[PDB]
Write a protein that binds this DNA or RNA. Structure first.
Ligand SMILES: [Mg+2]
Ligand SMILES: [Mg+2]
Ligand SMILES: [Mg+2]
Ligand SMILES: [Mg+2]
Ligand SMILES: [Mg+2]
Ligand SMILES: [Mg+2]
Ligand SMILES: [Mg+2]
Ligand SMILES: [Zn+2]
Lengths: 204, 60, 126, 141, 81, 96
RNA sequence: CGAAGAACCUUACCAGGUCUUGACAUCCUUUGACCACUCUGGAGACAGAGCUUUCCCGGGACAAAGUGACAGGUGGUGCAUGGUUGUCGUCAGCUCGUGUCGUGAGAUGUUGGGUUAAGUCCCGCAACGAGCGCAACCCUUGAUUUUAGUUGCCAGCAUUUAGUUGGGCACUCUAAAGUGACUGCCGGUGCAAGCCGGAGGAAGGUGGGGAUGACGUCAAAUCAUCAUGCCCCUUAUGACCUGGGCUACACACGUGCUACAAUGGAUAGUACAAAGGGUCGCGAAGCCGCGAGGUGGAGCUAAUCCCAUAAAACUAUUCUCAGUUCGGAUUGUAGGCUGCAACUCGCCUACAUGAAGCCGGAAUCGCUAGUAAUCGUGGAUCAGCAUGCCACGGUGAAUACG
């Protein structure tokens, strides 16, 4: 069959939407502003392990919280990275900006991060067995009560495609008391695109 | 086509009746909701992702 | 002034009872000018005849929501409630008559791909 | 179901529900009331008694069922359920009362209940014909 | 226009037709206008109306005033299968 | 004789923000009403689940609003200042 | 069905008229406001002129011309792909670790006896256990407590054309946190799981309805939402403009709306809804107009005000069973809106015309309850354009032997 996006199934249930504001007459403007913002962030901070972005609006200021595993790149030895960010984001938004940077602990408990790991591996021509399995073991060591992954594409350069999925632990997608994380990431290959999907069942 | 069409959307037409809506993400004209300004399919994506405020999945 | 609320479909009757001869007002109108049908008027009576209290009290009603039959059902419901209120020993009679059963039959959803709640299109293989 | 508000019969309410068209219970119920008023006019007696006699006349006992037997399909007779008994009576009543062709519906229905209490009418011809075919095919019981 | 606030006619056609009072009707006027009404002032001067692929001539009359130009220049050529 | 209208998408945030306002408003002036709930005006956007075909299979998205209303009954400049300083958990809208 | 809106635009197609670093981006070099508005030749794109371009503090942001790198392709392949989707099927099934049997493939488990909506649950068994699914956690509806009472309510009260004004949250209504329904209790039977009945209660047996769609099947559909490998065009398979076509018409199918009438139609009066939308948007009252509408501008960023007479129902009068006062097509004339523009090719109104049709061959479809049927309403898309789509309430059945 076809599965529902297990995040979308849980918005307004146990997860809060990431784009947080109220608006009227300003809604589309703020939305597409913040989509441009996420494009900027993903474009210039894919390397930095950026994995979640929550937006906030009040008093015209563009408040942001970037949850990342390595802060030391978003900030760090210079102190000028976040200032560059708010400068260019001022140029876009035509507003004020402020940017908190949160440290994620257990970076292998975020499906987005894990999917980027696997995707960079598969672009570097690593085996799609070892990739999935090592990501799984890293999660279950990092503290996941459940893990699941799959890859679909021209696996290994085939003509015909298929899917390879592997799971440890309890991963119930029909339960909603589940705190599940999910992600989909894309890898490029000289043969074509590979779709990596991940989802994690977490502690409490 | 679609890049030239997305351009021609944004510049002002000869007459104002010639306006028409397009999703800024993917400029498809059909099923674009002027309240969100998104097309239906991009809307479904982002609404799953929780990148749209206040919208969730309608049970009832 | 005894009191009860009564609900049927989307109809809501705030109803009250006083001791009287049998006169009845509904929305500042005659029961006959509001419910002209003998069937629905008898439906209103049903508690007052299940327990012989018709020739004793006046039924004073206000109503919103729904249609005429739904409002009637609400009214009899709130009436039976207020009869309980004035006398819990009417509980057995009115329960066994089924007037305390708040009619939970609400009007069902429409659904996608269906031309109603349950109706689907005309199927054709070819 | 439930008995009629006025008369102490569920048959009236069922007949109302079986004449009803698109929820028009008010129209159906009123015309049946006026039709009993008509038969009381032209007879002067118990509408319940005359309607009961008409029932008892239109009321079948035996009816065919279509059953595969011996490489074909046959009509085997069978004693009808007591509920389907009344159901078929009221059904037939309403359908002949529609296809009759007088002026007004209450009139059609009232004349049919009269004829039925008198052992006349299409509705009784129907019972007789059902008995006739079932009895023709009583070899298969 | 359907309304008393009208009529309508393209300025780029009205101007040429007004200049065509000294035409003497030896010449002919091409227009890509099919939406413009016919005034009586158009009478006599043949107009070559653009149907989609060609300019088709029409001779105006008193009888074809009040109508448009496209009614006399069909779009879809059809021959009874 | 002044009024606050709070409207948002999240009733827990909104209720708690209103309780915050009400406690601070009672501290800065004692006579104030409680918060009163209004109806939840909402919008159900109905979308094709598929891309190309399948008009018959869909997905529905409800954007609700929850909103509360407050009435101040004896203002002071202390109250006005406590509301002029205070910034709320965003995702909401305050109206005075 | 994509299409939750084909007049132009959309629009990708066609004819014509045109451009080639381009309609759209980066990198270089020169320059800096670029442009805007008027005139002329134009179908317009576009050419000629004018008036007039204020860049801001070497930097920043956007801009004209050169200049090649590049661009662009709704050009292809869904038999290379991702992602998204139907489908068997919300069917109850699909598997796995360890163990054991089998040379082995495979089996076992997962069969059996019962039971359940359900590989649900019990007893038994060379299997013991687990995962995905089922169920349940979620939303909504069904009764009720506390909190808060305005933009909602009006009982006890006065008074107004108006719940109006005062006053009060009684009651509704609203919406947060709670309660409750769990075979929890009783009787029968079962060994047991469970099954049947009974009580209380609003609700009794996963209460009702939703969302929620397992491994995988149809190389199912999608390169036209998007991205995307390969190939192809790259002074044209690219780009602009006007006009046309997507609305053709001998004919076939599907899906629906309207009817074929007296449980009805014309005319008048007239009661009771829910769910929704509104800022340059809803648009009141009053007035003009047969009417569609025009005028007007109140109130409203909305439980305040508007869209908004709800219609079926009911009551009266008439038509008297007729191709009819049925039906309402088609056509002619004249109007109104929208929009630069209503011929191709919008909708609506008035008058007239009055078509086919007097209940549908062989066949075939939905539905088990507030359902089917039936009546209106709203929303999206949208300037305008719906019998379509999604939600809303009103009325409200028949039947289930098996
Ligand atoms: Mg348009
Ligand atoms: Mg395929
Ligand atoms: Mg295909
Ligand atoms: Mg479930
Ligand atoms: Mg295929
Ligand atoms: Mg078409
Ligand atoms: Mg059955
Ligand atoms: Zn889009």
């Amino acid at each position: 069959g076809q599965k529902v996006h297990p995040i979308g199934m849980r918005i307004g249930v146990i997860r809060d939407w990431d784009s947080k504001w109220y608006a009227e007459k300003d809604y589309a403007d703020f939305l597409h502003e913040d989509l441009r913002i996420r494009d900027y962030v993903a474009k210039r901070l894919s390397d930095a392990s950026v994995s979640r972005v929550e937006i906030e609006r009040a008093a015209n200021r563009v408040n942001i919280t970037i949850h990342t595993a390595k802060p030391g790149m978003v900030i760090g030895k210079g102190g000028s990275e976040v200032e560059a960010l708010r400068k260019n984001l001022n140029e876009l938004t035509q507003k004020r900006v402020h940017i908190n940077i949160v440290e994620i602990k257990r970076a292998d408990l975020d499906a987005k991060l894990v999917a980027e790991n696997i995707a960079r591996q598969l672009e570097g021509r690593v085996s799609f067995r070892r990739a999935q399995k090592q990501a799984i073991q890293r999660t279950m060591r990092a503290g996941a009560k459940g893990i699941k992954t799959q890859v679909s594409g021209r696996l290994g350069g085939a003509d015909i495609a298929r899917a390879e999925h592997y799971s440890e632990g309890t991963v119930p997608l029909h339960t909603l008391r589940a705190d599940i994380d999910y992600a989909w990431e894309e890898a490029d290959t000289t043969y074509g695109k590979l779709g990596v999907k991940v989802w994690i069942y977490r502690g409490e | 086509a679609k890049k030239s069409m997305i351009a021609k959307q944004k510049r002002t037409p000869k007459y104002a009746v010639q306006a028409y809506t397009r999703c800024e993400r993917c400029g498809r004209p059909h099923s674009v909701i002027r309240k969100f300004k998104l097309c239906r399919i991009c809307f479904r994506e982002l609404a799953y992702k929780g990148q749209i405020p206040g919208v969730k999945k309608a049970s009832w | 002034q005894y009191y009860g609320t009564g609900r049927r479909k989307s109809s809501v009757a705030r109803v009250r009872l006083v001791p009287g001869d049998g006169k009845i007002v509904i929305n500042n109108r005659d029961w006959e000018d509001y419910i002209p049908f003998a069937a629905l008027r008898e439906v209103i009576k049903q508690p007052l005849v299940a327990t012989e209290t018709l020739g004793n009290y006046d039924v004073l009603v206000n109503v919103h929501g729904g249609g005429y039959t739904g409002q009637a059902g609400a009214i009899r419901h709130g009436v039976a409630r207020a009869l309980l209120q004035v006398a819990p020993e009417y509980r057995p009679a009115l329960k066994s008559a089924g007037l305390l059963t708040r009619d939970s039959r609400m009007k069902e959803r429409k659904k996608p791909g269906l031309k109603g709640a349950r109706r689907a299109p005309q199927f054709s293989k070819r | 179901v439930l008995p009629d508000p006025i008369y102490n019969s569920k048959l009236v309410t069922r007949l109302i529900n079986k004449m009803m068209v698109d929820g028009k219970r008010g129209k159906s119920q009123a015309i049946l009331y006026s039709a009993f008023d008509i038969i009381a006019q032209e007879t002067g007696k118990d509408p319940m008694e005359v309607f009961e006699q008409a029932m008892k006349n239109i009321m079948p006992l035996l009816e065919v069922k279509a059953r595969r037997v011996g490489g074909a399909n046959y009509q085997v007779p069978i004693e009808v359920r007591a509920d389907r008994r009344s159901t078929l009576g009221l059904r037939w009543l309403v359908n002949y009362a529609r296809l009759r062709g007088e002026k007004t519906m209450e009139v059609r229905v009232a004349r049919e209940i009269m004829d039925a209490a008198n052992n006349t009418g299409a509705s009784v011809k129907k019972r007789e014909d059902t008995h006739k075919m079932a009895d023709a095919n009583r070899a298969f019981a | 226009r359907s309304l008393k606030k009208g009529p309508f006619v393209d300025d780029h056609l009205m101007k040429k037709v007004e200049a065509a009072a000294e035409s003497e009707k030896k010449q002919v006027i091409k227009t890509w206008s099919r939406r413009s009404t016919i005034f009586p002032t158009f009478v006599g001067q043949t107009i070559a109306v653009y149907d989609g692929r060609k300019h088709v001539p029409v001779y105006v009359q008193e009888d074809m005033v009040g109508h448009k130009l496209g009614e006399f220049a069909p779009t879809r050529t059809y021959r009874g299968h | 004789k002044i009024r606050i209208r709070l409207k948002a998408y999240d009733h827990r945030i909104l209720d708690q923000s209103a309780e915050k306002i009400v406690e601070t408003a009672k501290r800065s002036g004692a006579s104030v009403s409680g918060p009163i709930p209004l109806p939840t005006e909402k919008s159900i956007y109905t979308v094709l689940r598929a891309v190309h075909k399948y008009k018959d299979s869909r997905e529905q998205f409800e954007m609700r609003t929850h909103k509360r209303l407050i009435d101040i009954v004896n203002p002071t400049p202390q109250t006005v200042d406590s509301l002029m300083r205070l910034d709320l958990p965003s995702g909401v809208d305050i109206e005075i």
